[PDB]
Design a protein around this ligand. Structure first.
Ligand SMILES: Nc1ccn([C@@H]2O[C@H](COP(=O)(O)OP(=O)(O)OP(=O)(O)O)[C@@H](O)[C@H]2O)c(=O)n1
Ligand SMILES: Nc1ccn([C@@H]2O[C@H](COP(=O)(O)OP(=O)(O)OP(=O)(O)O)[C@@H](O)[C@H]2O)c(=O)n1
Ligand SMILES: O=C(CP(=O)(O)O)Nc1cc(NC(=O)CP(=O)(O)O)cc(C(=O)O)c1
Ligand SMILES: O=C(CP(=O)(O)O)Nc1cc(NC(=O)CP(=O)(O)O)cc(C(=O)O)c1
Ligand SMILES: O=C(CP(=O)(O)O)Nc1cc(NC(=O)CP(=O)(O)O)cc(C(=O)O)c1
Ligand SMILES: O=C(CP(=O)(O)O)Nc1cc(NC(=O)CP(=O)(O)O)cc(C(=O)O)c1
Ligand SMILES: [Zn+2]
Ligand SMILES: [Zn+2]
Lengths: 152, 310, 310, 152, 310, 310
């Protein structure tokens, strides 16, 4: 990120989710179970920035993401920027592109979906609307505003 | 190698126009020339986790019309196998090791869809999942609509009753909205109006529709008058008291009906269609039911057979 | 003239080693080469006085796999025929005048045995009588154990769960205790231990067994890990709360499992086997269920046929 | 001491939970809702050591813990120590000894206990039986082994 | 005697504003200075043909707070009194020979009024008749509003939820439509919107009302926020989920809530009011349930006590 | 006021020995010299979320023996109060606005303690919460022992039956573990043995206990023989039959029974105590049920009456 004095270092063969909103950081570690490994991961919840001020920052080392795994980040930091990196150099830096689907992480607001009690990882069809994202469940086939799906 | 061979039958949303046709074509062939030993040696599970006599018997009868055997069950006083607790997934991983195809009805949406994730190579036909789909009797409504109108295009379709909750009208409408020329008439009180996600999909496809309050203002141009039931137990007594006489059909309301006009109703009708309409030539609901045998047959013969001698 | 021809099928205690074999041999023959019209023209009663979906459908399916017809019933909201009151004896003297063999399940021990005293010449197969026997799915467990291990001798068998009350483990154990070399492992809390009348019979036959507390202390030498359910509704909530995580199997507890090791469970499993084990190669419970079709088939083909062309 | 190899650089006065066993650092962030805050929060997991080898380690920049908070961690992070550091100088090393009352982060393994459906927080009476810590449900008054409560 | 002496409380429409104020006043007298033997020796019938634990408990406690005796029944599987399907009238006709007053709850609209034409000289207080009235509930609601606002005129009153079906809602609205300057805000899903019949009545009496889809739209200006329970059956699950937010309160939604705003709810609240709202000073649903005791006491006092002292 | 004034009786562990003696003492005062108007004007809630006719009848009679009023409910098919599945807390939160004390029975362990964190200032007395506590039962048991033995120290107390699950058993044991010199004899089938958690507690406080499989083994030395009901479901029938004898009393087993031995039983007794035991002078189970009236009276008196005179 921008600013470096008494901060963290850098890596060699790992990704760096930079520019992630405040509070949404930890959640991204939860929703996607990233800490669930042995790779040296480092976080920066509430960091110094230029435009957005305090952005959380995760740098899981020796771990790579696809153009899609990055797009799973899409709903929780459209601004963010995944940083593939090697030899201390940003080999490539991708951005959250809206996905065509979202599996495992989202829960079906349809209390009557067979999805719940059952041993199946959820799944929705994605489609941007004028002001939001429409998510359609693979099971009950009911569509919901992402504002309601992600809604607790 | 038949298109629907070994393919699951879950949502109308998954069946393309040609799919619908292969089913309705194969249907009439079977009604013209029955293949009674066609599915001989095949065992089929008739699992109704949500009891539903009319559909089940129509379904099972169809199965016997092609020579197959049936094992199954109805209602779930219990929990849906597991002596209570057991996931629908386990009770399907098991059953799927016995039969050649599962026909299922369930009170929860998604049910059949999950099912297909656990029956491996065993085709799962949905006979109704909660308020989601009922592919089955819609492939038979359609069959009925085409048998009597000769076509599924350039039709004038009116729909009455519980349009907000009738899961069969939503399907039929989505189904007909795959062919061209059709015009829709929606007659339902403001309380049970045809939802907007159905109307959007229509406007988005250049398909004409319009709302009306009386059957009389459209009875002259209607080819198919499709009546849905009124989920009475769902309303207030006084409210339904009102919103009735207005959306109830009588043989006299038929005075100006077109010569080729047919009346349909997924059944059962108790308040909606008066009994003095049964005798008029437009009454086609029981004939439509009978047609469930041929739609349900084609579907089974297609899913379980590579290439049919028809 | 087949050994099991027209003979009743009531207790594992009544089936000699060669009996078990003729059934498991005939079984595999039928799974290799099905005889679908074998029992054509035969009518069979599927009487489940104690509802039991999974077993009944597996049983009835088997019946249809050999060409037979089925009439029957499930649960007994009533009293077990007699419009209330009537003895099980009368309701069998009657039924036995219609069908060619009775398949019965009943909540009381002795039921099938009494039955055979009133069906005259009609073979009675027990599909479970109270807490006594369940010959049926034990002839299928065994079939499964031999199909995957190639043998029913010199095996290492571990048994987990409700061993005091699981009527299927008692049977399996008594069943395997008829062949030689087998070694038993009993893993169950002190509360549900394998009874002593089972252990006596073992010591009395020079058969080795031993008690263990963790699957891990035996996972390396186990050929068959046979999991029983935990009659939860039977314990105290806090007690079962404890005696769980200890006797629950997970795919990770499988790290050192033998290459040929199989996991079995009469089903249903909800707490006992984690869902992430299904995908590992040892998971064989659903395949074991499917095997109930072949064991149940052999049994019927044998009882109702003098000499089988196999 | 370790962070002065690939300089993540330690910071002044505050509290820095360190010597947590890897895979048990996301937990505390989660359980004790630690990322619910704003003070300069930095996190590093799967690090190096010796007899442990790895370790998670949260750093809560300037802001202190109670003597007991030092304890609640005792059930999860035994061998570990919160640093009562007063500006770079690691002065005040608090080592969390087993707490006697756990509230909120524990779940009563008793499926019949009143606590579950209702708006109350769990709470148990800690004691080291056979030394394997036996926790008592404030509600059902039933006692289970810490290794039964923790599982799920 | 007092205006309400030996009168009947069937509707919130058969009551005037003097009447109501008269009830609240008395209800305040009794709260401050209780008369525990005011109905000593009187016997009251708590007839709950329809089950309602919280109202029955309340009313009976108000019955014992004045020293009156009590007898009654609840949701009998087969209608209580008569004991065979005899008419409601023959039921009231008898109980009225035994008691000094009747409090009843019946699942049919107009039940209290019909009983009224049979109780002889016996006062009958309506506790609930189908989806029609429920006066005592409105009284305690008005008593709870008037106590905490100091008045019942020129009030900014917002009502959220199942405005379409909630009987307490329609009733409170009609009562407040007896006082002046009241301003209503109504927040509910158009499928559950406030009936026209009411907006039409407010239109006439010249009262200001507006529709809002969100609480935060007027949270700013409200004195009392009266929430309803959207009986989960009133809607299709997925429908419910998508409108759920429209009608649920949390502590954070309170930020810009006036100092004097109390949050009322007829209960049960459980899917509408987050428990964190509880500890806020606005929450007053429990204090509200508490005032049903003084309202019901006041009602009984007046009606069964001639020259009610105060 | 008195030590227990406005206190809560949730567990027999939150009570000391002064406490207990204080309750028995008061219970003796009231038995000898009754005060029928001690709670005149107080209203008590007899909330039996779980059905228990004998305890409810008892407690309510103790409630009317002091002149207090009563309101309450029983085993409602759908949880009482709230009337829809609202939380226990929202339930207590309201009733506490109506009453002066709450007596409740709930099928979930810890129900009385949770209510306690909601009854506001309202005393809640636990009548039974799942398989956890049931203090009032132990009080009357201690009151029945102390009255007929003249003491509660150095007593030879034998306990027979379902020692493993009986909550009254675990509780009496813990209470007597508050006094000195007590010696326990425990006679039950090892499958239903006295939990270690208790023998471990007796081990600490230095109390002598021994295990016996037969009553006649110690009949010789016992003062009080406290029998339990082995809930017939706790065991498999044939299992039950074979252990039945271990725990059943008859008159002839009494021959060498001490002069002072009383035979207690929390009831129901029906499969444990032969009716011939009834007419013996040792039988004291009914006198015991009789003392629940004075124990419950004592409890209510103390708790709702400040300066309890005696
Ligand atoms: N060895 C490295 C290399 C890169 N990064 C991170 O990768 C991102 C690269 O962004 P940077 O080159 O520092 O430019 P900025 O000014 O931060 O703006 P931008 O985020 O748009 O790149 C930053 O989070 C940087 O900290 C890192 O942490 N360690
Ligand atoms: N301002 C500071 C000071 C210390 N630490 C951390 O405090 C830990 C322990 O420091 P200390 O006990 O003073 O010396 P160590 O050598 O680390 O002790 P040990 O050998 O037990 O790890 C170190 O890992 C260091 O990173 C920190 O994060 N910030
Ligand atoms: O058609 C039937 C006869 P059944 O009462 O289910 O045996 N049932 C059915 C069909 C449908 N809808 C259809 O379109 C099938 P149909 O064309 O047979 O009416 C819906 C429902 C429902 O429960 O919502 C039930
Ligand atoms: O196998 C089944 C399937 P079902 O639930 O009876 O349809 N049931 C069964 C088997 C058995 N035991 C067996 O060994 C038969 P299996 O080998 O199929 O598990 C016991 C019981 C019981 O009620 O105690 C029930
Ligand atoms: O209001 C009460 C008891 P009370 O007069 O507040 O002590 N009961 C009542 C009111 C209401 N009032 C409503 O407005 C319906 P709601 O509770 O969903 O808001 C409904 C029911 C019901 O069981 O359907 C029961
Ligand atoms: O003891 C009582 C009434 P009480 O306090 O003696 O007036 N009821 C009670 C106690 C107990 N006490 C026991 O110890 C169980 P048990 O009656 O089998 O010995 C059980 C039940 C039950 O319904 O399961 C009910
Ligand atoms: Zn869904
Ligand atoms: Zn608990």
């Amino acid at each position: 990120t921008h600013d470096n004095k008494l901060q963290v270092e850098a890596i060699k063969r790992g990704t760096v989710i930079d520019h992630i909103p405040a509070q949404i950081g930890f959640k991204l570690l939860s929703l996607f179970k990233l800490t669930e490994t042995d790779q040296r991961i480092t976080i920066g919840l509430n960091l110094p920035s230029g435009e957005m001020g305090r952005k959380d920052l995760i740098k899981i080392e020796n771990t790579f993401l696809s153009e899609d795994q990055v797009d799973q980040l899409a709903l929780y930091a459209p601004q963010a920027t995944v940083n593939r990196i090697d030899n201390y150099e940003v080999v490539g830096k991708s951005r959250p592109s809206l996905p065509e689907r979202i599996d495992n992480v989202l829960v079906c607001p349809n209390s009557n979906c067979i999805s719940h009690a059952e041993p199946v990882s959820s799944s929705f069809a994605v489609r941007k609307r004028a002001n939001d994202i429409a998510l359609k469940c693979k099971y009950c086939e009911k569509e919901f505003s992402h504002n309601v799906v992600l809604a607790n | 190698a038949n298109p629907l061979y070994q393919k699951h039958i879950i949502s109308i949303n998954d069946l393309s126009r040609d799919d619908l046709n292969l089913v309705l074509a194969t249907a009439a062939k079977l009604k013209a020339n029955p293949q009674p030993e066609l599915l001989k040696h095949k065992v089929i599970a008739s699992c109704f986790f949500e009891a539903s006599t009319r559909t089940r018997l129509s379904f099972e009868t169809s199965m016997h019309r092609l020579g197959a055997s049936v094992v199954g069950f109805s209602d779930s006083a219990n929990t849906s196998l597991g002596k209570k607790g057991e996931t629908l997934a386990d009770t399907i991983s098991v059953i799927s090791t016995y039969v050649d195809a599962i026909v299922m009805r369930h009170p929860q949406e998604g049910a059949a869809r999950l099912a297909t994730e656990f029956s491996g190579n065993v085709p799962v036909l949905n006979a109704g999942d909660g308020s989601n789909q009922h592919p089955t009797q819609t492939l038979l409504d359609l069959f009925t609509i085409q048998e009597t109108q000769g076509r599924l295009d350039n039709l004038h379709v009116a729909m009455v009753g519980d349009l907000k909750y009738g899961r069969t009208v939503h399907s039929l409408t989505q189904a007909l909205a795959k062919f061209d020329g059709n015009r829709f008439y929606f007659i339902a009180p403001d309380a049970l109006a045809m939802p907007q996600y159905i109307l959007d999909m229509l406007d988005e496809k250049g398909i004409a529709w319009s709302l009306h309050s009386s059957i009389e203002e459209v009875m002259a141009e209607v080819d198919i008058l499709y009546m849905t039931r009124v989920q009475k137990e769902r309303l207030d007594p006084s409210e339904y008291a009102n919103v009735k006489a207005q959306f109830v059909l009588r043989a006299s309301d038929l005075h100006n009906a077109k010569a080729n006009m047919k009346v349909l109703h997924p059944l059962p009708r108790v308040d909606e269609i008066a009994t003095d309409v049964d005798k008029t030539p437009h009454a086609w609901y029981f004939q439509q039911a009978g047609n469930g045998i041929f739609a349900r047959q084609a579907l089974l013969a297609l899913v379980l057979n590579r290439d049919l001698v028809l």
